[PDB]
Each structure stands twice: as structure tokens, then as C-alpha cells.
Amino acid sequence: MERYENLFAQLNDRREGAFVPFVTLGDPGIEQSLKIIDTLIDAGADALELGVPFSDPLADGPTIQNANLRAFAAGVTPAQCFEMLALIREKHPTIPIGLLMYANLVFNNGIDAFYARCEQVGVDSVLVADVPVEESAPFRQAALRHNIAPIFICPPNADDDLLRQVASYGRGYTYLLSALPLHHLIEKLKEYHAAPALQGFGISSPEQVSAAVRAGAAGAISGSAIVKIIEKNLASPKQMLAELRSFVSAMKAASRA
Amino acid sequence: MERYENLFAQLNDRREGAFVPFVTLGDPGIEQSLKIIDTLIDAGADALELGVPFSDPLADGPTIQNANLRAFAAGVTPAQCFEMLALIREKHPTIPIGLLMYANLVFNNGIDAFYARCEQVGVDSVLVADVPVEESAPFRQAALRHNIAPIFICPPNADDDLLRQVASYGRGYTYLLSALPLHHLIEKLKEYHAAPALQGFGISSPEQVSAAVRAGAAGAISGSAIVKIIEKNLASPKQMLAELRSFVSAMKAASRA
Amino acid sequence: TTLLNPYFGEFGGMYVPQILMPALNQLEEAFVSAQKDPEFQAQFADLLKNYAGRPTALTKCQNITAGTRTTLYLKREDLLHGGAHKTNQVLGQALLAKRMGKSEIIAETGAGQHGVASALASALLGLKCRIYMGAKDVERQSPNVFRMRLMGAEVIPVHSGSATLKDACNEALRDWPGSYETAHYMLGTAAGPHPYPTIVREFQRMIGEETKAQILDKEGRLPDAVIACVGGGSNAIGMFADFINDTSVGLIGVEPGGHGIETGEHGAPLKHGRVGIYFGMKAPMMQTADGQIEESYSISAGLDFPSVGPQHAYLNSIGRADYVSITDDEALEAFKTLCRHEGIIPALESSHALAHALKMMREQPEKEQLLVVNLSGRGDKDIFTVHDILKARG
Amino acid sequence: TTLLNPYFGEFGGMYVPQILMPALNQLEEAFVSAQKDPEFQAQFADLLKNYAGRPTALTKCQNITAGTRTTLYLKREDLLHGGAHKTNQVLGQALLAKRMGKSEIIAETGAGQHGVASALASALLGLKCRIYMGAKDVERQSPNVFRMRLMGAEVIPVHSGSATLKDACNEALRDWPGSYETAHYMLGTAAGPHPYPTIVREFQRMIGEETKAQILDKEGRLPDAVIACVGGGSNAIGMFADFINDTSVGLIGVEPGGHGIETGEHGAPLKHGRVGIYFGMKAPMMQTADGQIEESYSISAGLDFPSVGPQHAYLNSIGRADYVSITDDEALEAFKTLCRHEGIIPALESSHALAHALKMMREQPEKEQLLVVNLSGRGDKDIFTVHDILKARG
Ligand SMILES: O=C(O)CNC(=O)Cc1c[nH]c2ccccc12
Ligand SMILES: O=C(O)CNC(=O)Cc1c[nH]c2ccccc12
Ligand SMILES: *Cc1c(COP(=O)(O)O)cnc(C)c1O
Ligand SMILES: *Cc1c(COP(=O)(O)O)cnc(C)c1O
Ligand code: NA
Ligand code: NA
């Protein structure tokens, strides 16, 4: 929770939207993944969103399915992922670090313990891709108890009940998935004092970062896009790091205005 | 009919049983078949029993099935068979010549015409292997009208009705197929004044020819046996002719007593 | 001398070697006695309810007929256990085999359907089954072969003559005279010597009688025509029997036309061969000018018998049923129509019966007519053949 | 908020991404409304009578039980059209798809049985069907593949994850949120998110209700135990449902033991895995210490799902049903027993259900007991697999 209140406050003083990139931990291997993520940060990512490889990611598109398989081909497991989360937090003490999990990875050895281990290593949020609000009671309660914000997706046709729920249950940020006008979903999430909105899915050029700020959101999240850059330059790690720094620098300069 | 009354009369004057060998016409080819059959006669066959190759011989065992296929491999047809029957009768005017036919070969182009053509070329009997007495009316009537004897099988468990029928309907000879004691079937066929009995199937050494005479029959018919000798010596026609002359000479000397 | 008629007008009879007569006559007397035997009739009624799955539904096919004035129903013998109507009469010929005290069954098969059938009834009823299959049919029907051995039958391949279904039928008739005191010869069509055409009809006749009651209840009147394919005749005479006396009902039998009647490569002796005597009987055959018997040709294995049941030649001669022909193509189309429109994969045999009903509708689409096709089996056994064809063409 | 319960004690629920919720809720309301809708209930009753061939017989198997005190009956869903019980609930999920105004069907399949099923119901009912099959299941099930294309379905192979049934179930759930306004996701077992376990039970429940009436009429009392195999749970819960309130009747579910429980190569998560959340639901799964989901292993394709229906975990937890396991060997024996003794070739799935009933009799041959096994499909699809095994050993 705190790091994200600090960062949104800080960004509001500067009239700047946040730019949050997503990567799968351990893709394409643990050492490469660590250098990808110090690169994203030095280039200006405001927060990271980071996924732990799960054998059955029923909520992910193809780019992210292939990122999982690559991490599995290198042998990555949840345990190494929590190892990597500790080293990333030891180097970067203020960046907000959010995880994208599947339910069985959290429920596996006890839902309280999993949110304890995130508290220990210094994670600030977890969004559980297959837990809808109606199933979310134990996972939100537990996350709350360990000072970790539970993130919810707010879909684009959300009825009023759901808006009300998502605003009441979530913290840190509201994941505002890109019928139903922006300008309505955004106003209503402010009205119900929801966590600040981040718009995500489909976000892959600077102009959409400027637009999401203008529409009233606090920033935007990009993942398929970052993940493709990895997928394209596997054979030349140095060029991978260059294209990622360029893309991230462009996206975060668009949030400045 | 006449040739067979003449031959049994002649054999009774000499106190001798008849020995009748069976061959498929055109096996293993038309020219070879002609020399096989002049050999059987010069060796002492008293009468011939001669089969026309039929595509489906449901009453024949394997030795005779293979004789049919061989004649078919040489191209033999019913027409060539009637051609060969004329040349055999032009050389041998008194030997009784009986055919073993299947029903469709006789019924094919009219049952009267078939018994006319046998009358023309000089055949003396036809036994239709798939016509039982109960279906035999047209075939016997027609055969009668063209002075050809219709031959019937009398099986070894024949009840009295059947004995009575076979004795009334047949001519030339009664084909006495080898529960029920010989000595009974034989006495009863005399009692009902049936055509003289020839015992056949399984007849393959001299001692069975002597035995069938002693039991009261007029002679015996051998076919599987002759047919195997052909099947064995296909590759050496001259040796085939030698073994056939030897076997037939032995069988017919056993009928003398 | 026989208890019942052996002939249907000129056709029929018992044309077998004399030494098979007592097996025929003994069969015929067993069958007469069973047909009046109320116990036997309840025993057979119970096997066909609880084991084989009777009655078989009557399905309306609304999607295939839309925009015409045809109502088409499908009598579903594809739903009977073992997947074809062949099961009805094996149960009854095996029950007769028991009533005579026999312990053993002889059977002939071509594509292997009747082989199966007679292996499953012999397994259920505690008979020892041996079957004859031409070697050509052996080698191309290894699925069927293995099923009959699963079910405990002994399978014998016949290498003689053409080594197909007829050379099988020939080896059957050769073994039975040595064995008919403990072995029953379980013929698989409404053909061969009397009493086999009568017995196979009467153990297939419930096809027709349940079709009548099931149309009467659904439509309140009888069919304008019932339609069935004709390889030897049993499923067709089973469909038709109970309607021969309702003279407004149409009986239509369909023969295989193969490559087409004009190529001579077909299985349609009833309208295109000539009266001969072969397998025990006087009926139409596929034969030469000279009288040798030939093979039929059909894409469908099951219809490839170069002769036909004598009762079919009789009801053609008096004009109470009509007979026609459908080509390998025609039947492949009707098989693809039913799979895509009704979600029923039919046997290539039954597809010819449906091919003619689809031309009955397509030819005259505003003729009002109520049509039943006997769908005599399912067509899983035939999907490799149809994929291989479709593949060969693209 | 839901109209009915999503849970059976601890197990069940709707664990799906938020954007799939409205498709679930819309399904659940369609189903509630149909269940009180007398018209819908007559429409489904008529498809299952006239098209699919209900009621299915109850066969006594006297030969297998002789010399013991077991009475064994076989409920024959192998006689239902398409050859397995999977047909009952596709007809009903397609009829629901129509009632919502949908025109399109999504399906997942492994060995290809449920793929077929949903292709034939979509062909009959005028729906456009597309199916997802893992590529590994593609390549080894080319028979099924071709049948679904005959019947007009579009088939999509899934190359992700392990490219088998579960990676299929994953691609289903990914397409539906873009399409649920004209496309119904036709899940093929009593598992996944609520409402799918309840709906599949209630469209399979006539298995049980006709078994009860058919035993009551034949034996005048209820079974001591009903027995069924458990891959995801639908044929078993369809057999058991109507007997859960007749507490003297035994409910026994049989899981695949594969090579044996101790090798770890099995499909028996209910008694040998651990509670997890995967495919929409909280139930027992085959998973690592770490929580990744694994494949089951069974000689039988159809039982290879590394989780199980939640209603089965619930009735195990309260001791109203019992669950056990049968090995690839055990089931191969019971498949050869039924082919040679009763002339019924069963599916390798159902052979495990029969394997346990044969050990129930063989273990205690003078226990008086009335046993029904749900023979959930036939086994023609499985004879190459069993010939290849038997051949490998001699
Ligand atoms: O892929 C993107 O552009 C954004 N994706 C995410 O923010 C991360 C993500 C991976 N899988 C998901 C499922 C649900 C929500 C987010 C994710
Ligand atoms: O083969 C024999 O030993 C005797 N055979 C004959 O006499 C000729 C024959 C060939 N086939 C037959 C069918 C019935 C009767 C005789 C024959
Ligand atoms: C064998 C078979 C046929 C052909 O025989 P009939 O005796 O002519 O009925 C027809 N349909 C099926 C499904 C068959 O298995
Ligand atoms: C698919 C199938 C099964 C397994 O699924 P359940 O949902 O567990 O019933 C069992 N038997 C047959 C014949 C099958 O086709
Ligand atoms: Na025919
Ligand atoms: Na399972």
C-alpha cells in the first residue's frame, strides 16, 4: 500500500501520470530478467508489475503465454521468483512492486502465508487474475492484514454495483481495463473514492499514455508491448536492453505531458 | 443310358466290377487333359466321369477346387469342354462318358438345350452336384427326353423314402456315396431295382475296389486320387502319364477280383 | 417334402447337394415349432429389448428437407447394439440353434459385419463360433477380425475361388454336412436355400412393425414410401414385410450402382443380371454369357453380393415393390449430407437408401410426400474409406 | 450474487477473471428459467427420445457372475447415439444456448469424444461450432478430428502449455469473454465454474432416474451399489444423483490408477491429489509441492483430467460416496472379459468401472449383492489401443 500513496502524491505535485511496465520474472532467465528490470527502472518506470510463471495462465494472451514458457524452460519456480523480488527491493527501496498471480500460486500453501511472504520481501500489491470480486474475501482480508494492497480489474462495461465494489475493496491503484465511455468509468471511480486508476491492455505507444492522463486516469500500464521486445531480441541481449530503454523512455516522457 | 447297360452286362458275364476314374476337363490344359484321359482309358478305366470347371463348386473338396482353378488359369470354358467331349467320343465309341455339373451350367441357357447338346456330342450321363431329388424334376425329365441318364447320389444314411426315390429316378448307375451298413443300402437299392451301384469318395487303393464288389456294388469311382496325381506331377507331364497308368492298372486289376 | 413353401413364384428353392437336405429340413421343422412356441417368442422379445436395445427410434430429419414438401424419417437400426440391423436375426438364429440342442455356429462374412454379429450372439448365448471369411476380405478388414477374436470366435480365411464373400458362402456349405448334428449354419442375409429367406425375414420383421406403429403415432397415417438398401435383402425385407399388405405404401429397394450400371462395375443383379441357380437358390445373379458367377462391385463392402434374396425378385416381378440403383458418388454425397445436417454418420450401405430419398425430394420439391428410410447401420467403420476418397480428389 | 449455490461444502465456486462473470451469470439465469419452463423440458425430453435413443436398456450379465452370488446389470449409455453418455448434456447445453439467442458454440476436447458430441448437437440444432483441441490430442486422434469436420465444426489445435486437454480448457476460457453475447461455451464435464457442475448434473441425471425405475421393475428393490468411472464426473454424477437420498444405496466412483498410485503416473486426484484452484473452481488437483498443475496419465484418454467435479469431492468428504482406483491392467482385463462373455465391447473409460465391480464379486464370491455398473460408452474407438498392447506383450 504506502509506496503507491507516496508515488501518486509525488506524481500529482509534478502534474505527471505514472508509466508502469509489466514483465514475467525469470524471462528469459533469472540473471537476464534482473538486468531487464534494472533497465526498465533506470529508464523511468514509475512502478513495476511483475508475474510469477504459472503452468496454466488462463487469463493471458499469446505474448505472455510464451514469456511463461520461456521462464519454465529456464527452470524458474515461485521460490526463485521471491528470491529475485528480494534483490530488486534491496536495490530500489521506493518503487512500488506489484505481482500478477494466479489463484492456485497464492492458495497453495495457505493464503495468509503467501501475503506474509510478499510483506517480507517488500512487495506492495498483488492482483489475482482469476479471482473476481465475488470470490475475493479471503484474499483481500489477508492482503490487508499484511499491508499489501489487493488490486482489482474494473472492466469497461462495469455496472454501478461493481464500480462500488471495486472502489471499496481495492487499494494502491484500480486496474482499469481498456460497452462504456472512459470518461464515465473514471468519474464514477473518483466519486466512490477508489484507488487511482491505471489504464491497461493495448497500451503500446506514447500517445496512449497522454490520452489516458487527459481522460483523468493516473497513469498507464504496458506489458504485451514490453514482452514482445524481449521475444524479438532474444538472441542479442544488448540490443534487447537498448530497445527496452528507448521504448520505456518514450512512454514515460509522454506522461510528463 | 445304353452304353452303361451294355458295359454292366459285359462286366457281369466276366464276374468283374467296373473302375471309373474322375478328372476335370481342361486340367491342367486342353491338350494335356486329352492325353490324360486317353491314358486313363488305355490303362483300363471302364467308364469316365468328367467335370466341367464352374467358378463356384460348393460341393467340392480342395483337390478338386484346385483342379478347377488350374483349368480356369488355362482359359477353359463350357464350350471348349463340349469340344473336347466330341473328340473323346470320336475316338472311343463305346466307353460310358458321364459329366459332373453344377446346376447353373445346365440351367444357363435352357435345361433342355443343355441335355440336347450332351446327346449330340455323345455323353451318356450327367450328375448335377447341387440338385437334390426334391428339385430334380426338370432336369431328370429333360435328361430322359434326350436319352441321357440322370445320376443321383444316394447318401449313407438314406432313409427308405429316399432309397425308393433314388431307385425310381436315376439311370445308368446309382452314385453310392461312402450312419448305416453297406450291406443294407446295397440290398435295398437291388430290391427297388435301382441302377447298379457304384461306390465313390475316399476310394484310393486297390483293396477298396475289391471290397466294394464283395459288398455287392458294381464297381467303384476314384477322383480325388486321380486328381492328386496330376497336382503332383505338373512339372513333368511324362512322369504324370506314368503314374496315372500305374495307378489305374492296379485299381482295375482289383475289380477282376 | 417341406412344411412351408420354399419358393416365391419362380424364385427360391433348395439347390444344395443331397447330403445337406436333412440339416435343412431339421432347421425348418425347429423354426415352425418355435414360431408357435410362446416361450421362445418371449425369450427372443426379451434379448432384443434388454440386450440389443429395441425398439429403435424413428428420427424426423427437418434440416435436410427444408424448403421442400418432403417429411423424411430415419428408422434408426444404427442405434442397435453392434451398430446394424444384422443383430436382430443372429439373436433369433442362435436361439433356434439352442432349441435344436446345438452347441456350435458356422458363419460366413465378407466385410466382417455379419462375422461380428454372429461372434457376439455366440458369446452371449454360450455357443462356440467359427467363421469363414475370404482372405481378401481378411486382409482389408483387420478391425472386424480382431473384434471377432475378442469375442471368442475362431476365424478361418478362405483362399479359394476369388477369396471373397461368395467363396466364403461356398466353404460354409462344405463344412456343414459333416457337422449339422451339433453345429448350426448362421447365414447372414434373406437369401441361400429354403428355409433361410423365410427365417431371416421373420427375425427382421420387427423393423417394419415398429416403423408402422411409430409413424402412426407421430403422423396419424402410413408412409407414402419406405426405402432400403439391397445387398442380399434382409434389412429391406425386414422394413417391408409388414407393409406388403398396405397397398398404398410404396416399397423401394435400392441396389448399388457402383461406377455406374453401364460400366458393368455394380451390384445390381435384381434389375441388371439374369436368373441363375447358385448358393442354394434360383434368383438373379451377376454372371457371364456362359454362366460363371461374378463379384459385385460397390464402394460399400456390405452390398457386394452378386445375387439377391428371392422374395425381392418375386415382389419386383408382380410390381408390388420397385427396385432402383445409386452410384458410389451418389451415396458419398448423401453420407456427407447427413453428417453435416443432422449430425448422424450413416453406413455407406444405408447412404444409398438415403441418396435415393434425397433424389425423390430434390427431383420434385413440391410433391407432398412422407418418406421413411431404414438407416440400417452407422458409419464409423466407413470413415477411413470416405477420408481416403475425399483426400484422393481434394 | 447468484441464484443458486456455487459451492458443495468447501469445493466449487467461480474462479474466473472478472470479465467472465457476466457470461456466467447470464448462463445461470437462462438455466433457472429453463428448468421451470415446461416447454423446454418437453423439447429436451423429445430430442433425447427420438434422436438420441433414450431410454437406454439395463442389461443383466448372467455369464460373468456365474458361480457367485453377485447379480450384475450394465446401464447401457454405449447404445446412445454417438456411443457415450456425453450426448445427453450437449443436447441440453445447446438447447440452453438457443434459449439465450446464441448462434455459436465453443468447446474444448481431449481424446475427441466431447468434440464430436458438441459437433453433432451443433449440426442438428443449427449452431456454428468451433472447437479447441490440444495439438498432442490432435495428432493422435485423427478419426475424431475428421468426424467433427464432417459434421461442419471448425477444429482449432492448441500448441500452448502441454498442448493437451487442460491447455484446451485454457483456450476456451480466453475466447469466451470477447464473444459470450452470441457464443455459448459448451463445457464437457461436471467441473469448471459454477453454474457448469450443476447444469451438467441435471442434464445427465436421467442416467440414474431410468436405472432406478428399470431395477425396481426387474428386481423389485434398489441396487446395493451403483458403480461409475470418474474422469471429470459427469457420467458418475448422472448415475448417482437420483440415488443420493436412498441412503442404503452404495455410490462408488472409480478413478484411473494408471501404472499404479505409487508410480505417481495416474489420474486420481480425488483420493491422491490436494485441494487447489484451477479451471474456475476449488477442487482436488494433480499438482507439484509448489502448486503448478500436472497431467493425469491413464491408458484411457477420456479419464485423463488432473482434477475432478466439486460435487464428487463433497460427497467423498461427508462419506455419502466412496471413491477408489483401477490400474491400466485391471481395466484391460475387465475389457477382455466383457467382449468374451457378454459380446459387448466397452470403452476403456467404463472398463475401469466394470474392473471394480468384478473385484467386488471375485473378492467375496459368496456375498449376496445387486450391482449396476454405468457402462458410459462403447469401445470401438479403443480397439487399436488394446490390440497394440496385447501385441507388444504377446
Ligand atoms: O499484457 C498487458 O498489456 C497488460 N498485462 C498486464 O498488466 C499483466 C497481465 C499479464 N496477464 C494478465 C491477466 C489479467 C490482468 C493482467 C495481466
Ligand atoms: O472326388 C472323388 O473321389 C469322387 N468325386 C467325384 O466322383 C466327382 C465329383 C467332383 N465333385 C463332386 C461333387 C459331388 C459328387 C461328385 C463329385
Ligand atoms: C450387411 C449390411 C447391409 C446389407 O445386407 P442386407 O442383407 O442386404 O440387409 C446393409 N446395411 C448394413 C449397415 C449392413 O451392415
Ligand atoms: C469422456 C468419457 C468419460 C469421462 O468423463 P466423465 O465426465 O468423467 O463422465 C467416461 N466414459 C466415456 C465413454 C467417455 O466418453
Ligand atoms: Na446383391
Ligand atoms: Na480426473
Strand order in the sheet with B153-154: B149-151, B125-128, B97-101, B48-51, B18-24, B219-222, B197-200, B174-177, B153-154
D24 has a chain A CB within 8 A of its CB: no
Count of positions (residues) in chain D: 394
Spatial CA neighbour of B69 closest among B81, B55, B82, B58: B55
Q: Decide if C109 contacts C134 (C-beta within 8 A).
A: no
User: What's the rounded Cα separation, in Å, for the pair D305 and D324?
Assistant: 16
Q: How many Cα atoms sit within 13 Å of B104 on the Cβ side? A: 28
Distance from chain centroid for Cα B92: 16
What one-character DSSP code corresponds to residue D260? Answer: B
**B interface mutation test: which of C4, C16, C18, C295 has the most B CBs within 10 A?**
C18
d(CA C278, CA C296): 14
DSSP code of residue D365 = T
Ligand 2 neighbour B52 (Cβ under 6 A) = no
Helix axes A30-42, A78-91, angle to 10 degrees: 30
The 3-state DSSP class for residue B100 equals strand
Q: Is the dihedral of CA C334, C338, C340, C341 positive or negative?
A: positive
Residue pair C306/C37 in contact (Cβ under 8 Å)? The answer is no
Cell 466330341 belongs to which residue? B86
Interface probe, candidates C14, C174, C175, C277, chain B, greatest B C-beta count within 10 A: C277
CATH class of C53-85+205-390: alpha beta
Other Cβ atoms closer than 10 A to B16: 17
Tell whether the torsion through CA atoms of B167, B172, B177 and B183 is positive or negative.
positive
Question: Considering only CA atoms, which of D278, D155, D198 is closest in space to residue D24?
Answer: D198
Asked if B130 is an active-site residue, the reply is: no
What are the E-state strand segments in A74-227? 97-101, 125-128, 149-151, 153-154, 174-177, 197-200, 219-222
* Cell numbers for C147: 473384434
Task: Name the residue with cell 512339372.
Answer: B235
Residue D250 has which C-alpha cell?
Answer: 452404495
| Beta pairing class for C7-8 and C274-278 | unpaired
Name the one residue in this structure whose C-alpha cell is 466276366. Answer: B14
- Number of Cβ within 10 Å of residue D69's Cβ equals 12
By three-state DSSP, how is residue D283 classified?
strand
Candidate from D76, D80, D81, D86 with most ligand 4 atoms within 8 A of CB, to mutate: D86
C-alpha cell at B251: 485299381
Chain C CB contacts of B65 under 8 Å are: 160-161
With CB atoms and an 8 Å threshold, state whether C57 touches D76: no
Closest CA of chain C from B122, distance in Å: 21
Report the Cα A201 to chain-centroid distance in Å: 11
Interatomic CA distance for residues A89 and A96, integer angstroms: 9
Dihedral sign computed on CA atoms, order C174, C177, C179, C182: positive
Contact present, C185 and C206 (Cβ < 8 Å): no
Using CB atoms within 10 Å of the CB of residue C388, give its burial: 0 to 12 exposed, 13 to 18 middle, 19+ buried.
exposed
Contact check, Cβ <8 Å, D49/C59: no
| Interface size between C and D, measured as CB pairs under 8 A | 99
- Domains of chain D by residue range: 8-52+86-204, 53-85+205-390
Candidates D190, D206, D214, D217; CA nearest to D242 is D206
Pairing between strand D11-15 and D280-285?
antiparallel
Q: What are phi and psi of C2, to 5 degrees?
A: -145, 160
> For residue C57, which phi and psi values (nearest 5 degrees)?
-70, 175
**Hey, what amino acid is at C5?**
N
Chain B CB contacts of C291 below 8 Å: 78, 104-105, 107-109
Q: Residue A169: which CATH number?
A: 3.20.20.70
With 0-12 CB in 10 A as exposed, 13-18 as middle and 19+ as buried, what is A214?
exposed
User: In the structure grid, which three cell numbers stand for residue B47, read together?
Assistant: 467308364
SS (H, E, C) chain C: CCCCCCEECCEEEEECCHHHHHHHHHHHHHHHHHHHCHHHHHHHHHHHHHHHCCCCCEEECCCCCCCCCEEEEEEEHHHCCCCECHHHHHHHHHHHHHHCCCCEEEEEECCCHHHHHHHHHHHHHCCEEEEEEEHHHHHHCHHHHHHHHHCCCEEEEECCCCCCHHHHHHHHHHHHHHCCCCEEEECCCCCCCCCHHHHHHHCCCHHHHHHHHHHHHHHCCCCCEEEEECCCCHHHHHHHHHHCCCCCCEEEEEEECCCEHHHCECCCHHHHCEEEEECEEEEEECECCCCCECCCCCCCHHHCCCCCCHHHHHHHHCCCEEEEEECHHHHHHHHHHHHHHHCCCECHHHHHHHHHHHHHHHHCCCCCEEEEEEECEECHHHHHHHHHHHHHHC
Are residues D226 and D372 in contact, defined by beta-carbon separation less than 8 angstroms?
yes
Q: Where chain C is broken, by preceding residue (C–N > 2.5 Å)?
A: none
Do B66 and B72 touch, CB atoms closer than 8 A? no
Q: Which residues contact C364 (CB under 8 A, 6 or more apart)?
A: none
**CA nearest to C78, candidates D52, D120, D207:** D52
Residues of D within 8 A of A62 (CB-CB) are 160
- Which of D53, D151, D339 lies at the smallest CB-CB distance from C76? D53
- Partners of A71 in the beta sheet? none
Q: Which candidate in A46, A49, A187, A243 is catalytic?
A: A49
| Cα separation, C168 vs C161, whole angstroms | 9
What are φ and ψ of residue D370, in 5° steps?
A: -105, 120
How far, in Å, CA of C149 to CA of C171, rounded?
Answer: 20
Give yes or no for a contact between C223 and C231, defined as CB atoms under 8 angstroms apart: no
Orientation angle between helical segments C113-125 and C86-99, nearest 10 degrees: 40
Comparing CB atoms, the residue among C19, C173, C293 nearest residue B104 is C293
Q: In whole angstroms, what is the distance from residue B129 CA to residue B111 CA? A: 15
Which amino acid, one-letter code, is at C16? V
Touching chains C and A? (3+ Cβ pairs < 8 A) = no
The Cβ of residue C273 has, within 10 Å, a number of other Cβ atoms equal to 22
Q: Write the DSSP assignment of B1-59 as a string of letters.
A: -HHHHHHHHHHHHTT--EEEEEEETTSS-HHHHHHHHHHHHHTT-SSEEEE---S--TT
Domain coverage including residue B245: 1-257
Q: Which residue of C has its CA nearest to D55?
A: C53
Cβ-count burial A12-21 (b if 16+ within 10 Å, e if not): eeeebbbbbb
Contact D53, C79 (CB under 8 A): yes
Sequence-distant (6+) residues with CB within 8 A of B190 are B216
Return the C-alpha cell found at C296. 459385385
Distances (CA, A) of C71 to C354, C360, D241: 13, 11, 39
Q: First and final CA of chain D: distance in angstroms?
A: 59
Q: How many angstroms separate the CA atoms of C116 and C152, rounded?
A: 10
CB contact under 8 A, B105 and C291: yes
Chain D residues whose beta carbon lies within 8 Å of the beta carbon of residue C123: 339-343
C285 vs C267: CA distance, rounded Å: 9
d(CA B110, CA C237): 30
Nearest CA to ligand 2 atom 15: B129
C111, C113, C371, D229, D380 from C133: Cα distances, Å = 8, 11, 36, 37, 21
What amino acid occupies position C110?
A: G
The total domain count for chain A is: 1
Helix boundaries (H) for chain D: 21-36, 38-47, 86-99, 113-125, 135-140, 142-150, 165-175, 196-202, 206-219, 234-240, 269-272, 310-317, 328-342, 348-363, 383-393
Report the nearest-CA residue for atom 4 of ligand 4.
D231
Contact A2, A146 (CB under 8 A): no
For the four alpha carbons of D305, D306, D310 and D315, in that order, the dihedral sign comes to positive
Look up residue B164 and give its amino acid. R
| CA-closest candidate to residue A177, choices D79, D178, B152 | D178
Residues 6+ positions from C2 with CB-CB distance below 8 Å: C25, C28, C194, C195
Whole-number Å distance, alpha carbon B219 to ligand 5 midpoint, is: 44
Of C373, C343, C347, the residue nearest C113 (C-alpha)? C347
For ligand 1, atom 5, name the residue with the nearest CA.
A223
Residue in the structure block whose three cell numbers are 457448469:
D196
**Half-sphere exposure (Cβ direction) of C33: Cα atoms closer than 13 Å:** 11
ω into C195 cis (within 30 of 0): yes
Helix A182-191 / helix A160-169 crossing angle, nearest 10 deg: 50
Report the alpha-carbon distance of residue D312 to residue D321 in Å, rounded.
8
Peptide bond into C55 cis (omega under 30): yes
Which residue matches cell numbers 476460457? D173
- Index of the ligand 2 atom closest to the CA of residue B203: 3
DSSP annotation of D141: T
C-alpha cell at D44: 429436451
* Exposure string over D232-263, b if 16+ CB within 10 A, otherwise e: bbbbbbbbbbbbeeeeebbbbbbbbbbeeeee
CA distances for C261 relative to C264, C268, C272, C307, C327, angstroms: 6, 8, 8, 15, 8
Q: Given an 8 Å threshold on Cβ–Cβ distance, is A132 in contact with D21?
A: yes
Task: Determine how β-strand B219-222 pairs with β-strand C7-8.
Answer: unpaired
Q: How far apart (Å, rounded) are the C-alpha atoms in residues A139 and A128?
A: 9
Rg (CA), chain A: 17
Q: Using CB atoms within 10 A of its CB, is residue C217 exposed (0-12), middle (13-18) or buried (19+)?
A: exposed
What ranges in chain B are assigned the alpha helix state H? 2-13, 30-42, 62-73, 78-91, 103-107, 111-121, 137-145, 160-169, 182-191, 206-214, 224-232, 237-256
Ligand 1: nearest atom to the Cα of A203: 3
Give the Cα separation of C131 and C124 in Å (integer): 16
Amino acid letter, D103: S
First to last CA, chain C: 59
Pocket test for ligand 1, best of A23, A40, A100 (most atoms within 8 A of CB): A100
CB of D312 closer than 8 Å to CB of D230:
yes
How many Å lie between the alpha carbon of C1 and the closest alpha carbon of chain D? 38
Topology of domain C8-52+86-204 in CATH is Rossmann fold (3.40.50)
In one-letter notation, the amino acid at residue C131 is I
**Residue to substitute in C77, C116, C234, C373 for testing ligand 3 pocket (most ligand atoms within 8 angstroms of CB):** C234
Which of D123, D143, D146 has the CB atom closest to C342's CB atom? D123
> Residue A249 and residue A42: Cα distance in Å, rounded?
9
Catalytic hit among A5, A31, A46, A60: A60
Angstrom distances, CA of residue D138 to CA of B192, D156, D166, D303, D386: 78, 9, 14, 17, 20
Calculate the alpha carbon distances from B154 to B48, B131, C189, D202 in Å.
Answer: 19, 13, 30, 71
Q: From its phi and psi, is residue A164 left (phi > 0), alpha (psi between -120 and 50) or beta?
A: alpha
Q: Return the residue whose CA atom lies nearest to atom 14 of ligand 1.
A: A129
Q: Which residue has the cell 439311370?
A: B171
User: Residues D58, A216: contact at Cβ < 8 Å?
Assistant: no
Q: Which of B104, B108, B155 sits opposite C18 (nearest CB)?
A: B155
Asked if residue B28 has a cis previous peptide bond (ω within 30° of 0), the answer is: yes
Catalytic residue status for C85 = yes
How far, in Å, are B224, D79, D237 from residue D379 at the CA level?
Answer: 48, 11, 21
DSSP character at residue D49: I
Q: Which residues of C touch B152 (CB under 8 A)?
A: 18
Contact B153 C278 (CB under 8 A): no
Cell of residue C13, nine digits: 428353392
| Residue C188 grid cell | 447372414
Measured distance CA(B235)–CA(C124) in Å, rounded: 52
- The torsion of the CA quartet C271, C276, C282, C286, rounded to 10 degrees, works out to -50
Pairing of strands B97-101, B48-51: parallel
Shared fold status for D8-52+86-204 and D53-85+205-390: yes
Question: Quick one: angle between helices D348-363 and D328-342, nearest 10?
Answer: 90
Contacts of B202 (CB under 8 A, 6+ apart): B178, B208
The C-alpha atoms of residue B55 and residue C292 are separated, in whole angstroms, by 5
Neighboring chain C residues of B129 at a CB cutoff of 8 Å: 17
Question: Closest to C79 (Cβ–Cβ): which among D53, D59, D387?
Answer: D53
> In whole angstroms, how far apart are CA C112 and each of A145, C116, C164, C224, D78?
71, 6, 11, 34, 21
Give the whole-angstrom CA distance, residue B99 versus residue B128.
Answer: 8
Distance from CA of D10 to the nearest CA of A (A): 13
CB contact under 8 A, B104 and C276: yes
DSSP assignment letter at D55: S
Question: How crowded is the C-beta side of B222, counted as CA atoms within 13 Å?
Answer: 27
DSSP one-letter code for B197: E
Determined by which method? X-ray
Closest by Cα among B126, B131, B213 to B173: B126
| C-alpha cell of residue B179 | 450312419
Sheet of strand D280-285, all strands in order from the earlier edge strand to the far edge: D7-8, D11-15, D280-285, D274-278
